[PDB]
A paper describes a structure:
Beta-2 microglobulin (β2m) is a 99-residue protein, physiologically acting as the light chain of the major histocompatibility complex (MHC) class I. β2m displays a classic immunoglobulin fold, and is well conserved among vertebrates. β2m tertiary structure consists of a seven-stranded beta-sandwich; according to standard nomenclature, β-strands are named from A to G, and loops are named after the neighbouring β-strands. The characterization of β2m structure and folding dynamics gained considerable resonance when the protein was found to be responsible for Dialysis Related Amyloidosis (DRA). The mutant protein is the etiological agent of a previously unknown systemic amyloidosis, whereby patients carrying the D76N mutation accumulate large mutant β2m amyloid deposits, especially in internal organs.
Conversely, D96 and D98 fall in a negatively charged region, clustering with E74 and E77. Notably, the D98N variant 3D-structure is among ones at the highest resolution for a monomeric β2m mutant. Although D98N is the highest resolution structure (1.24 Å) here presented, the electron density in the area surrounding the mutation is not of excellent quality as elsewhere in the 3D structure. The side chains of the C-terminal residues (R97, N98 and M99) and of the spatially neighbouring E74 and E77 (in the EF-loop) are only partially visible in the electron density. Moreover, the electron density of the EF-loop is weak between residues 75–76, suggesting transmission of conformational flexibility from the C-terminus to the EF-loop region. None of the variants showed a marked Tm variation (relative to wt β2m), however some features are worth noting. Both D96N and D98N mutants melt with a Tm 1.3°C higher than wt β2m. Although such ΔTm is relatively small, the consistency of the two values (for two mutants that concern nearby residues) adds significance and indicates that removal of a negative charge from the C-terminal region slightly stabilises the β2m fold. Even if the D98N structure is well superimposable with that of wt β2m, the D98N mutant displays local increased flexibility in the C-terminus and the neighbouring EF-loop; such flexibility is somewhat unexpectedly mirrored by a slightly increased fold stability (ΔTm + 1.3°C). Differences of roughly 1 or more standard deviations with respect to the wt structure can be observed only in the in the DE-loop of the D53N mutant, and in the EF-loop of D59N and D98N.
Author numbering: 0 to 99
């Protein structure tokens, strides 16, 4: 058996073909086993509509998830990624740095 804690990155991107749109991304990387729970949060509340959830693996024991959706941030709103995994005794919450 092998288990690996995910690395978690939270960041925003504008698609270059449509630069006015903005996407909030979580990249949850290098984890094993593949069982996982991942949410985007807005002011502590789970975002129910997340448009994209893309899972892949490299080696048979390394999984990668890109979880992202369109959003319109304002400076009053706080966003975060919340991940649960067997390697994490408590849910891990990674705040979005608004300059990233």
């Amino acid at each position: 058996m092998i288990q690996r804690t995910p690395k978690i990155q939270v960041y925003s991107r504008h698609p270059a073909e449509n630069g006015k749109s903005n996407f909030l991304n979580c990249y949850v990387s290098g984890f094993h086993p593949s069982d996982i729970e991942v949410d985007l949060l807005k002011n502590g509340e789970r975002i129910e509509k997340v448009e994209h959830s893309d899972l892949s693996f490299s080696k048979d024991w390394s999984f990668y998830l890109l979880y992202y959706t369109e959003f319109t941030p304002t400076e009053k709103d706080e966003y975060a990624c919340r991940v649960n995994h067997v390697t994490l005794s408590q849910p891990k919450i990674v705040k979005w740095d608004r300059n990233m």
